[PDB]
Amino acid sequence: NIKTINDLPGISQTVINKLIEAGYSSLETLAVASPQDLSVAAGIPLSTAQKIIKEARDALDIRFKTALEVKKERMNVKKISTGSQALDGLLAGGIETRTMTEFFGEFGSGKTQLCHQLSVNVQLPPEKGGLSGKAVYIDTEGTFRWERIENMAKALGLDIDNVMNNIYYIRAINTDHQIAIVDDLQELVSKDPSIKLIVVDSVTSHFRAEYPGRENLAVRQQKLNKHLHQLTRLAEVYDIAVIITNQVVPGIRIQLKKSRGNRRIARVVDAPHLPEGEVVFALTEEGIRDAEE
């Protein structure tokens, strides 16, 4: 919009020259530096350096704002595509921030395969179905494989090294560690706003192991709900999409059936704001895609 150095009110060419000559080629250069560093580096009157510095900060939107108009600025709906039209549609557009979305099914139904894909797909620009955001992969079992990622990255013509740089990975070794990790997400995501996706494949893993009996069922429920509340609150309070998987106060629950060959049926089970349907997608070298026929 009011983007370049020229666009700011009645600035002289005489001036604009001295700015480029002083290495303040952009609005950002100005908006960071002080009028004192500017008024010597540019070689201009101090007052003038200050005028400009504010007219930049004002040209970019660096001002006071009511907390309401910051809400209205960023409360908008944000969704990440799965790679499958069909599946995005079932999801009414895709994976949504401030929502925990669960995918459960038997091994190789594509619950873990989605996670990988989405940890790439967040990094895409919005026009391409992403949020230009990072992702956190929490792994209970060692299911995570960077090579699955690398493949999905190649498949979009993306920079492989970079894609992998935008995914933080940890392995939950233990139910207790798994809670520490989610507990410490709050700091990490405040330290790094660009994180728009947390996945936890696959949550119950460690709870079933450590609390196996049907007397441990309640003993492990109280433990598992506490843990999902945490996740749910991260999503809401930090505007992040949370995905959990599962083998066989929460959110959306989608089951995943194996169908003919590479193709999978995702049916929705619990999501009262979503239509009751099921749809078919496919698992490919490239990652999640739509099916043939």
Task: Detail the residues annotated as belonging to a binding site.
Answer: 105-112
Using CB under 5 A, which of 99, 112, 117, 175 touches Cl ion? 112
Q: With beta carbons less than 8 A apart as the criterion, state whether 121 and 130 touch.
A: yes
Binding of Cl ion by 117 (CB under 5 A): no
Q: Is 252 helix (H, G, I), strand (E, B) or coil?
A: strand
Nearer to Cl ion, 5 or 283 (CB): 283
Q: With beta carbons less than 8 A apart as the criterion, state whether 122 and 83 touch.
A: no
How many angstroms separate the most distant Cα atoms in the chain?
81
- What is the CA 24 to chain-centroid distance, rounded? 33
Interface of this chain with Cl ion, residues 178 to 237, rule: CB under 5 A: none
- Minimum CB separation from Cl ion for residue 284, in Å? 13
- Minimum CB separation from Cl ion for residue 287, in Å? 12
Nearer to Cl ion, 3 or 260 (CB): 260
- Residues 52, 54, 55, 56, Cα dihedral to 10°: 90
Nearer to Cl ion, 97 or 246 (CB): 246
DSSP 8-state code for residue 128: G
Q: With beta carbons less than 8 A apart as the criterion, state whether 245 and 115 touch.
A: yes
Q: With CB under 5 A as the contact rule, which of the stretches 2-10, 73-81, 85-93, 108-116 interacts with Cl ion?
A: 108-116
Number of residues near Cl ion (by CB under 5 A): 5
- Minimum CB separation from Cl ion for residue 235, in Å? 22
Residue nearest to Cl ion (CB): 112
- Minimum CB separation from Cl ion for residue 106, in Å? 9
118: enclosing H helix or E strand: helix 111-121
How far apart (Å, rounded) are the C-alpha atoms in residues 80 and 130?
A: 5
Binding of Cl ion by 113 (CB under 5 A): yes
Window 57-96: contact mask with Cl ion (x via CB under 5 A)? ----------------------------------------
How far apart (Å, rounded) are the C-alpha atoms in residues 41 and 22?
A: 5
- Minimum CB separation from Cl ion for residue 112, in Å? 4
What is the amino acid identity at position 128? K
Beta bridge pairs of residue 200: 138, 244
How far apart (Å, rounded) are the C-alpha atoms in residues 174 and 65?
A: 44
- Minimum CB separation from Cl ion for residue 117, in Å? 11
Binding of Cl ion by 140 (CB under 5 A): no
How far apart (Å, rounded) are the C-alpha atoms in residues 78 and 97?
A: 6
Nearer to Cl ion, 9 or 108 (CB): 108
**CB neighbourhood size of 26 (10 A):** 15
Residue numbers in the known binding site for ATP are 105-112
Nearer to Cl ion, 113 or 255 (CB): 113
Nearer to Cl ion, 97 or 112 (CB): 112
Chain contacts with Cl ion (rule: CB under 5 A)? 108, 110-113
